[PDB]
């Protein structure tokens, strides 16, 4: 158990193809449910290979996690997990 955000609808991704775009990232997680928020984190105009995906229901996310957990992308295993700290911007 935990005392974080009530309902894990958003998730996190890492180790994404340098070419991997937002559009693809979305439709990619769509398989699970209806993706709403989808973007690709970047630094000074440089892909980081990490993004996020938000769903309509909290249950879905919990699923998309494992469903995509270790999804060999273009020969690159990605790390999918549920985001517990999705409140506000995440950057120093």
Swiss-Prot record:
<feature type="modified residue" description="Phosphoserine">
    <location>
        <position position="57"/>
    </location>
</feature>
<feature type="cross-link" description="Glycyl lysine isopeptide (Lys-Gly) (interchain with G-Cter in SUMO2)">
    <location>
        <position position="72"/>
    </location>
</feature>
<feature type="cross-link" description="Glycyl lysine isopeptide (Lys-Gly) (interchain with G-Cter in SUMO2)">
    <location>
        <position position="48"/>
    </location>
</feature>
<feature type="modified residue" description="Phosphothreonine">
    <location>
        <position position="21"/>
    </location>
</feature>
<feature type="cross-link" description="Glycyl lysine isopeptide (Lys-Gly) (interchain with G-Cter in SUMO2)">
    <location>
        <position position="41"/>
    </location>
</feature>
<feature type="modified residue" description="N6-acetyllysine">
    <location>
        <position position="28"/>
    </location>
</feature>
<feature type="cross-link" description="Glycyl lysine isopeptide (Lys-Gly) (interchain with G-Cter in SUMO2)">
    <location>
        <position position="23"/>
    </location>
</feature>
<feature type="modified residue" description="N6-acetyllysine; alternate">
    <location>
        <position position="54"/>
    </location>
</feature>
<feature type="cross-link" description="Glycyl lysine isopeptide (Lys-Gly) (interchain with G-Cter in SUMO1); alternate">
    <location>
        <position position="54"/>
    </location>
</feature>
<comment type="subunit">
    <text>Identified in the spliceosome C complex. Interacts with PPIA/CYPA.</text>
</comment>
<protein>
    <recommendedName>
        <fullName>Heterogeneous nuclear ribonucleoprotein M</fullName>
    </recommendedName>
</protein>
<comment type="function">
    <text>Pre-mRNA binding protein in vivo, binds avidly to poly(G) and poly(U) RNA homopolymers in vitro. Involved in splicing. Acts as a receptor for carcinoembryonic antigen in Kupffer cells, may initiate a series of signaling events leading to tyrosine phosphorylation of proteins and induction of IL-1 alpha, IL-6, IL-10 and tumor necrosis factor alpha cytokines.</text>
</comment>
<feature type="cross-link" description="Glycyl lysine isopeptide (Lys-Gly) (interchain with G-Cter in SUMO2); alternate">
    <location>
        <position position="54"/>
    </location>
</feature>
<feature type="domain" description="RRM 3">
    <location>
        <begin position="9"/>
        <end position="85"/>
    </location>
</feature>
